[PDB]
Write an enzyme that holds these catalytic residues in place. Sequence first.
Site, PDB file in Angstrom:
ATOM      1  N   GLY A 230     -12.788  80.165  51.933  1.00 43.18           N
ATOM      2  CA  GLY A 230     -13.254  81.420  51.365  1.00 43.18           C
ATOM      3  C   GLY A 230     -13.332  82.612  52.307  1.00 43.18           C
ATOM      4  O   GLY A 230     -13.512  82.459  53.516  1.00 43.18           O
TER       5      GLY A 230
ATOM      6  N   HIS B 291     -12.000  81.402  46.889  1.00 39.14           N
ATOM      7  CA  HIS B 291     -12.752  82.583  46.462  1.00 39.14           C
ATOM      8  C   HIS B 291     -12.804  83.662  47.531  1.00 39.14           C
ATOM      9  O   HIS B 291     -12.920  83.358  48.707  1.00 39.14           O
ATOM     10  CB  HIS B 291     -14.197  82.159  46.146  1.00 39.14           C
ATOM     11  CG  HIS B 291     -14.867  81.421  47.268  1.00 39.14           C
ATOM     12  ND1 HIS B 291     -15.570  82.055  48.276  1.00 39.14           N
ATOM     13  CD2 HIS B 291     -14.944  80.095  47.542  1.00 39.14           C
ATOM     14  CE1 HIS B 291     -16.052  81.154  49.113  1.00 39.14           C
ATOM     15  NE2 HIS B 291     -15.682  79.959  48.693  1.00 39.14           N
ATOM     16  N   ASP B 292     -12.690  84.919  47.101  1.00 37.37           N
ATOM     17  CA  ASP B 292     -12.802  86.086  47.973  1.00 37.37           C
ATOM     18  C   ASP B 292     -11.723  86.286  49.040  1.00 37.37           C
ATOM     19  O   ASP B 292     -11.916  87.067  49.965  1.00 37.37           O
ATOM     20  CB  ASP B 292     -14.178  86.067  48.629  1.00 37.37           C
ATOM     21  CG  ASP B 292     -15.281  85.813  47.621  1.00 37.37           C
ATOM     22  OD1 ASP B 292     -15.384  86.608  46.664  1.00 37.37           O
ATOM     23  OD2 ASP B 292     -16.025  84.821  47.778  1.00 37.37           O
TER      24      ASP B 292
END
Lengths: 12, 12, 12, 262, 262, 262
Positions: free
Chosen positions: D143, D125-126
């Site tokens: 992340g 994520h991200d």
Amino acid sequence: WMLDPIAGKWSR
Amino acid sequence: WMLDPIAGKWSR
Amino acid sequence: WMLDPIAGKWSR
Amino acid sequence: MIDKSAFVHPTAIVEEGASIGANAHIGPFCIVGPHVEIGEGTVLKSHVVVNGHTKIGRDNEIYQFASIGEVNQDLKYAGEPTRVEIGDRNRIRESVTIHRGTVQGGGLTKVGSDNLLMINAHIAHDCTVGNRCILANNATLAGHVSVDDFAIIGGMTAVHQFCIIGAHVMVGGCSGVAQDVPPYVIAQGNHATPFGVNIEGLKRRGFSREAITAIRNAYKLIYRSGKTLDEVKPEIAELAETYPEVKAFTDFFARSTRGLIR
Amino acid sequence: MIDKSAFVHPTAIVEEGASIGANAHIGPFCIVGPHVEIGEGTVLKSHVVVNGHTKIGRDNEIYQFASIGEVNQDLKYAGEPTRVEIGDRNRIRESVTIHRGTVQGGGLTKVGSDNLLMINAHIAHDCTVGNRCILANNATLAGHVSVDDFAIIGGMTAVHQFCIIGAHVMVGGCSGVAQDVPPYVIAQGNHATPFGVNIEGLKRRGFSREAITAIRNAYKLIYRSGKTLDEVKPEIAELAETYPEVKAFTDFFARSTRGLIR
Amino acid sequence: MIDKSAFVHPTAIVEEGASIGANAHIGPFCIVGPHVEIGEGTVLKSHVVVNGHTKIGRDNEIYQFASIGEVNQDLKYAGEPTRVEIGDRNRIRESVTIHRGTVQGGGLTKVGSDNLLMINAHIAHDCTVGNRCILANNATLAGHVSVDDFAIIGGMTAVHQFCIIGAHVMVGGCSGVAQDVPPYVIAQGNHATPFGVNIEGLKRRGFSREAITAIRNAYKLIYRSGKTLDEVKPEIAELAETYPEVKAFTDFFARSTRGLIR
């Protein structure tokens, strides 16, 4: 010259 | 504080 | 004797 | 909607709302969610799962058992409608996983174009992956990680959260990157440390002899001069006035928040 | 039998004999063997294989390409009807593998509740994972391994056969655990060695200042006093008479057979 | 063509031209390309992809999410019709990937018989794996690698391009092999170094006391005598005149091109 991505190195 | 499971550490 | 493939060793 | 020229295998499941571009190919047993956009010419071999609010570019080749746009692994994520954006001509191999962002991290996981994501590579994520990058087998980005253009991440290497892997960087396999890696640098080991400039990579990408030398001098300032980073910054900026390629360091320092590997 | 409120996708294959609880969800292309029991509310996203004599609890979320209850990798296994038991509210991510036990090891691989098993985590035959644990990406448990409550195993870390990862322990990524890890300890490296107490973890789980201090003192006895383990055991038991949280060490020593990491 | 005694699940897709032997089993959701040959008694559990010009032997067991014969990851590969050959009685576990060769490397990726390829093991383009080998979880062979008979490669270990892993060798997990490993040797660490002879392995495979001693003496010549490799070669050949098992070293040296690990 040879690129070895898995090894993460340029080999000779 | 931040938990990084992949790193296996508590980060700051 | 015990073979541990993941560890890659023979254990006792 | 599905373009008339796109092919959707009878066993594949493309949910109403999905947008499939011209000449795209959705192989057998694939699943494409209602909020997915697949660009022109992109191919999903078979057994591929793509969901979430995800936009994929043109001419990508996504192999079997890959999971794209899926819920991330952050314990804070609660199902918010975050997104994933993938560019063009990427080669996403078997079992690669690219997860959606978190609201806390910006709500977006982004991948550029012309990248090679090898078997079981993971983009959490991200994360933000640039262009022409290579993530080798089992390479894992925690992340909030940034991987800049042309960077190569060795097999089984894990990049810790929030770290930046500079442009043209080469990270050796079986490594643990706990801090930021300046551009043009070769790093390796757990935790990772610098071992010089990626000269061969720069040669193959058209860098002149002068630029490579300037880059090596910039490297020496950072790791050899012995001068604190803040004393070196203006020196490197100075150097960049003559050799533009050196500004990469300047732009990198402005983004760094984890400190440099040493 | 399949509960009337459960959903089984038309492409999924649930063999006669399987027991699917109320409001469970078996997504597309999933395979559920005849000896499988799936609890109420459990979800199998898609492309999930579950076989063998396997019992899965309530509210679990199992992601695509996971393999649960499958034949183990022990060369001694010959197809005996062994089992797997998984608790409630576990999050089992893409490509996770949980294998059935061996007769020689007890015939059972067990996983508790509220665990997060990240991408490609592996739980070999005869392992016992507790509750509230986290196995990060590519974390690998060899056969006969025990992972106690709240333990976190870093990415790409392998735990060798028969080892015990104590409660509230944190193992850094890219590690090789060849011996037992006492509870409340932070370990890292190949082979793994101790680096203190997981203070932050204990803080977040409600441990009082007194308990944390008692635990640190117990840690010092083991790795600082210089006194052999057998001389330290009664000392720690003594300490536990006042601070119950310290008994965790006592219970751990009684189970240890690989010796402590040092 | 498909043998009358072979079973092909209705959901499986076997393309016209594929050759499936007697009593073979192609489970649900499997894909078998037109240039594939599957030998007698071989089983594809489910969710298996096999394509390219690939020949698979008899009595193999291939588990879900494995990818066999697929396009390799070499950036030089341009779709040329290369091949894969797999022998008999191999156990290929979940998520294993075996890729086709490259023209530049010889056009062939080969695997022998009686091997155990554990979860997520990777066999890159142009590799040659012998017989009775074990590649543990996440074991990764880069391109052009040779793994000789009885060799065992530990979990998460990566073997660099063009390297040779000698017969009866044992590589510890979490390792990085950057050079050739003589037969009968135990290696470990990144980069990998030698730690003696695999005595236990030799005992279990019928080697006599005399042969094991001769092998240990050969090992000492290479890593203990202090004599350059070229001075040791004739000495080992001499020794092999009495103990044939020692010729393994001689044959190995003739193939080595990356130098020996030390």
